[PDB]
Design a protein around this ligand. Structure first.
Ligand SMILES: *[C@@H]1O[C@H](CO)[C@@H](O[C@@H]2O[C@H](CO)[C@@H](O[C@@H]3O[C@H](CO[C@H]4O[C@H](CO)[C@@H](O)[C@H](O)[C@@H]4O)[C@@H](O)[C@H](O)[C@@H]3O)[C@H](O)[C@H]2NC(C)=O)[C@H](O[C@@H]2O[C@@H](C)[C@@H](O)[C@@H](O)[C@@H]2O)[C@H]1NC(C)=O
Ligand SMILES: *[C@@H]1O[C@H](CO)[C@@H](O[C@@H]2O[C@H](CO)[C@@H](O)[C@H](O)[C@H]2NC(C)=O)[C@H](O[C@@H]2O[C@@H](C)[C@@H](O)[C@@H](O)[C@@H]2O)[C@H]1NC(C)=O
Ligand SMILES: [Cl-]
Ligand SMILES: [Cl-]
Length: 596
């Protein structure tokens, strides 16, 4: 967050409705919260809003304050697992990180052993936080998620941040998250939900409810790298969150130190104890594979460092030993070096950063649509920074497998982009306190910055409407509004659901002719006239009627019909509709797919 907000064009000095923001409550359903974090200090805060009805559990030495005004925990139907501690306290770290990303106060000199040094903060530093612990070492059960929703809605939260999700698609009314969020929506409470980390294949997201704001994860300009310099002077740019100081060590290949009963064929990967523990003590081992902190403890005990490799390095992770993930070619160069001299060595440097001009790009793991339940409703809905985010961390929770002297941690996931969107949606709410969940969501989607389909060919099924743009979302001009009824209304076709985007499923090479009805509501007091601008690939005939709309003022509503005709050869074809009065730009992508 020391860079993400700035990257989004949301500096520390953005305008704010402080009194309103100070009375908004952000509900966070996660692994609980660590109250001692600097991000949750309450100096200067006034008492909890009169509307607040939530309570504060005291188990496990927990104490609420004027910042964290609510703290609950749920663990229905089974005994706790090793590592779990009854109470609302965050012993995992995930909930403290997401909560601080959404509403953490400004914390200067925020860093992880110097990495990412700057001022950390959430979208709404003045907002109150109500934590609901529903995730434990055995996961987050349907029963607890629903328990949290039942209380949160009644307690008075204004918005919900949910960085959790199911692995497989389920029908809305036999899905705890869909059910809870639906009832939250009927009470005017929006839920920002992570899309999932099961990408990059199509059909991997389970955040399918139309009423949910589903969020993908994308990169930012800052990128952590870990330079590795072998003995001959060659320098390779690897990827990892490496906090260890530079140091020269002897180098060794897993291929040349097979463990008992193993041979070069498998020892080259270093996994499953395939490398001789006696031949790698105090050395940097070269492994032709990539793995996590667990494997380090399982097969590499004794090593001074580890060099891994992978074809996918669009995000960095921390490890229990100095390490870096090298590109295959650099791994090959390292091996040639090893066999070019009798005593090879290398130095793994402490991580540094580079500027990636391609950002934002949806990251490899971000879950992709189409919507498995309602294939005509595009998912995910939008993208935000979810790669290498620095935010609050419990001083006792491990980082990369081990305990370290830090109050912050750098991690990636749609669980990191979700709270950025929560912070932004909340900021929008401070300026438009009467808006419905659908309206707030519409604002973020119609002002989202278009992303490059050449860097993410899956297009809308990877990033939805695009990259979130905070300052533009505050005043969208017009919104595609909706309420509980619309989601269960019978007209009830699907192409008539007033959604901020248009989705159509067809067959390849065949011709089609479908139409969508929509209604725009002006959210600005000044009147103006909008004209429609359509951009469609060859082979498609897209038109809107009317193609001009005038709004007389705040709340004025105008309907229109969109007709799409033609055929497609590829799996995904993208087009777009933009309504503009010269001041506002209301963009809705149109996606045609032949995927089944
Ligand atoms: C600046 O950021 C960009 C975006 O993250 C980096 O480019 C990406 O690099 C990764 C490797 O870490 C590439 O991953 C391979 O992806 C292919 C499949 O590609 C196709 O599908 C993906 C979606 O899954 C689309 O995004 C692509 O456009 C394409 O349609 C897969 O078969 C491989 O097994 C890898 O997973 C990724 O494709 C690439 N994205 C783009 C848009 O280029 C970029 O990384 C540098 O450039 C790439 C090409 C590699 O040479 C890296 O080693 C380089 O580091 C990064 N730049 C820097 C300097 O870090
Ligand atoms: C597209 O959805 C619109 C939802 O607002 C429909 O218009 C609304 O129709 C209501 C009648 O059931 C009427 O009370 C509302 O005032 C009106 N909303 C506004 C202000 O536009 C629209 O229905 C058609 O168009 C309206 C103007 C009437 O002529 C209806 O009889 C039409 O069916 C929907 N368009 C479609 C797909 O027909
Ligand atoms: Cl208690
Ligand atoms: Cl128990």
């Amino acid at each position: 967050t020391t860079r993400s907000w700035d990257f989004l064009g949301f500096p520390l000095t953005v305008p704010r409705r402080s009194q309103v923001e100070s009375n908004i409550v952000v509900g966070v359903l996660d692994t609980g919260i660590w109250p001692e974090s600097p991000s949750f200090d309450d100096e200067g805060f006034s008492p909890p809003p009169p509307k607040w009805k939530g309570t504060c559990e005291t188990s496990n030495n927990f104490r609420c304050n004027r910042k964290i005004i609510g703290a609950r925990s749920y663990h229905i139907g089974r005994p706790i697992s090793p590592g779990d501690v009854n109470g609302p306290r965050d012993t995992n770290g995930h909930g403290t990180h997401t909560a601080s990303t959404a509403a953490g106060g400004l914390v200067s000199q925020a860093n992880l052993y110097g990495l990412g040094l700057g001022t950390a903060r959430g979208g709404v530093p003045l907002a109150r936080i109500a934590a609901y612990k529903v995730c434990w070492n055995d996961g987050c059960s349907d029963t607890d998620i629903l328990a949290a929703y039942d209380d949160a809605i009644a307690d008075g939260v204004d918005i919900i941040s949910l960085s959790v999700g199911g692995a497989n698609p389920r029908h809305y009314f036999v899905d705890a998250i869909a059910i809870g969020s639906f009832h939250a929506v009927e009470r005017g409470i929006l839920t920002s939900n992570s899309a999932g980390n099961g990408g990059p294949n199509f059909f991997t997201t389970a955040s399918l409810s139309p009423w949910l704001l589903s969020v993908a994860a994308s990169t930012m300009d800052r990128k952590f790298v870990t330079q590795v310099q072998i003995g001959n002077g060659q320098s390779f740019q690897g990827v990892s969150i490496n906090t260890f100081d530079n140091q020269y060590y002897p180098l060794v290949s897993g291929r040349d130190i097979p463990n008992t009963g193993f041979d070069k064929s498998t020892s080259r990967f270093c996994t499953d104890k395939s490398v001789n523990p006696n031949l790698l003590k105090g050395k940097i081992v070269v492994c032709e594979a990539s793995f996590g902190p667990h494997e380090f403890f399982k097969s590499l005990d004794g090593a001074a460092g580890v060099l891994m490799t992978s074809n996918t390095r669009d995000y960095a992770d921390s490890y229990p030993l100095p390490s870096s993930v090298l590109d295959p070619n650099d791994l090959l160069a390292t091996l040639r070096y090893i066999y070019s001299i009798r005593s090879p060595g290398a130095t793994i440097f402490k991580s540094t950063t580079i500027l990636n001009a391609s950002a934002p790009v949806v990251v490899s793991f971000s879950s992709r649509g189409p919507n498995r339940a309602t294939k005509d409703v595009i998912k995910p809905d939008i993208s935000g920074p979810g790669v290498e985010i620095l935010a609050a961390w419990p001083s006792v929770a491990p980082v990369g497998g081990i305990r370290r002297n830090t109050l912050f941690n750098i991690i990636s996931g749609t669980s990191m982009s979700c709270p950025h969107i929560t912070g932004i949606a909340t900021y929008v709410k401070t300026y438009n306190p009467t808006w419905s969940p659908a309206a707030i969501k519409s604002a973020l989607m119609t002002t989202a910055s278009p992303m490059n389909a050449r860097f993410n060919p899956q297009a809308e099924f990877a990033y939805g409407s695009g990259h979130v743009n905070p300052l533009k979302a505050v005043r969208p001009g017009l919104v595609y509004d909706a309420n509980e009824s619309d989601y269960v209304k019978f007209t009830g076709r699907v192409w008539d659901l007033n959604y901020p985007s248009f989705g159509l499923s067809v067959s390849p090479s065949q011709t089609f002719n479908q139409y969508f009805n929509r209604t725009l509501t002006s959210v600005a007091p000044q009147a103006s006239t909008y004209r429609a601008m359509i951009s469609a690939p060859q082979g498609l005939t897209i038109s809107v009627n009317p193609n001009v709309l005038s709004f007389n003022g705040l709340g004025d509503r105008k309907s229109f019909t969109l007709t799409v005709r033609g055929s497609i050869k590829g799996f995904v074809v993208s087009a777009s509709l933009v309504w503009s009065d010269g001041v506002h730009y209301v963009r809705s992508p149109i996606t045609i797919t032949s995927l089944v």
